[PDB]
């Protein structure tokens, strides 16, 4: 029953 | 055929940031940055599902850092202001002295910053009013809804006043019983 977050990634550099 | 969108944003110099989930143009939930709580669009959603607000706050921190990188990389190229189009409607056909809701639909605008004020006979309405967060669009502009429940009468006129940096003067959209 938990909504999953698409984890944000850092840009370069 | 359905679409689920996890829409986020970070805006400078305002330091404004939002995180939300969209299902076919409708908001499932959003996370308030002032607090650390998952705000469900409808009460029932929170009873059938759950979300860890911490994930949203962590993503907003990454978006902020990414915006800094992007601002520098673009050699400080600013956003072009796209002014909104405003529509005032009622959630159902209006019946005299039978409660209804006034909807102020703010659409097709960027950046996601707007000052929205309901006016009853030219006077601001501070209580009873509710609003949505900045909702996504296919063209990557923003949508927003402002709500005002009311008792329809022939003596009370309403106006939704919207202010945006893309507008020369505030936009006023009218509603009266006919």
């Amino acid at each position: 029953r938990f909504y999953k977050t698409l984890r944000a990634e850092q840009a370069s550099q | 055929e359905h679409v689920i969108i996890q829409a986020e944003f970070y805006l400078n110099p305002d330091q404004s940031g939002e995180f939300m989930f969209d299902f076919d143009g409708d908001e499932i939930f959003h996370v308030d940055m002032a607090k650390k709580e998952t705000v469900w669009r409808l009460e029932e959603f929170g009873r059938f599902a759950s979300f860890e607000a911490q994930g949203a706050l962590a993503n907003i921190a990454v978006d902020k850092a990414n915006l800094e990188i992007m601002t520098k990389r673009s050699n400080y190229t600013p956003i072009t202001n796209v002014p909104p189009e405003v529509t005032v409607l009622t959630n159902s056909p209006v019946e005299l002295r039978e409660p209804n809701v006034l909807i102020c639909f703010i659409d097709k605008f960027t950046p996601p910053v707007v000052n929205v004020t309901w006016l009853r006979n030219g006077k601001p309405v501070t209580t009873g009013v509710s609003e949505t967060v900045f909702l996504p669009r296919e063209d990557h502009l923003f949508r927003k809804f402002h709500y005002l429940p009311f008792l329809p009468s022939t003596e009370d006129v309403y106006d939704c006043r919207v202010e945006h940096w893309g507008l020369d003067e505030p936009l006023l959209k009218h509603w009266e019983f006919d």
Partner: protein, 189 residues
């Protein structure tokens, strides 16, 4: 406030076809409303949309961990989240409230417009037809189109441009997923 603004818009999209049979994931990034870089599940790696996104596409594609997480999203993120909210999103069916009332094009003449108000329904998929004495009236129809109220309800007003003559029976027929056969509301002059 005349100060310049800078906006970063990540959009993580999950597109569904035949339930969860075919699922497509897109991780898109917009800088000042302009798409710079994107991951599309049909491609399998990051691609630059503008020259601004080229460093990110190359950097994210060089990391096997980032690529594997994005390639797994259709199952671990898309299909998962679809199942979490299915009962109150995909399964959501809210009946329309159908009302028929006469109105006027301009306040200088008698009732020359018949309004069919179709409100508070979910989902947005709807068909509204006007009938006069069992025959479909195609010409003279003006609608507001589909209106999203923002509270998981939709509304529409389908108006017929007609001068009602006594004895005429007009029917507004509504078709929506919430009801098995069509809905009908009659109006007599």
């Amino acid at each position: 406030d005349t100060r310049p603004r800078f906006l970063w818009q990540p959009k993580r999209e999950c597109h569904f076809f035949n339930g969860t049979e075919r699922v497509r994931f897109l991780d898109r990034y917009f800088y000042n409303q302009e798409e710079s870089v994107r991951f599309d599940s049909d491609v399998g790696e990051f691609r630059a949309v503008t020259e601004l996104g080229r460093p990110d596409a190359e950097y994210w594609n060089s990391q096997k961990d980032i690529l594997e997480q994005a390639r797994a999203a259709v199952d671990t993120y898309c299909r998962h989240n679809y199942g979490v909210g299915e009962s109150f999103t995909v399964q959501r069916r809210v009946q329309p409230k159908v009302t028929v009332y006469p109105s006027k094009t301009q306040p200088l003449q008698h009732h020359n417009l018949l309004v069919c108000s179709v409100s508070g329904f979910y989902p947005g998929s709807i068909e509204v037809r006007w009938f006069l004495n069992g025959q479909e009236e195609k010409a003279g129809m003006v609608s507001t189109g589909l209106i999203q109220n923002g509270d998981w309800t939709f509304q529409t007003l389908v108006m017929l441009e007609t001068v009602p003559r006594s004895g005429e029976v007009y029917t507004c027929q509504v078709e929506h997923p919430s009801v098995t056969s069509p809905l009908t509301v009659e109006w007599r002059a």
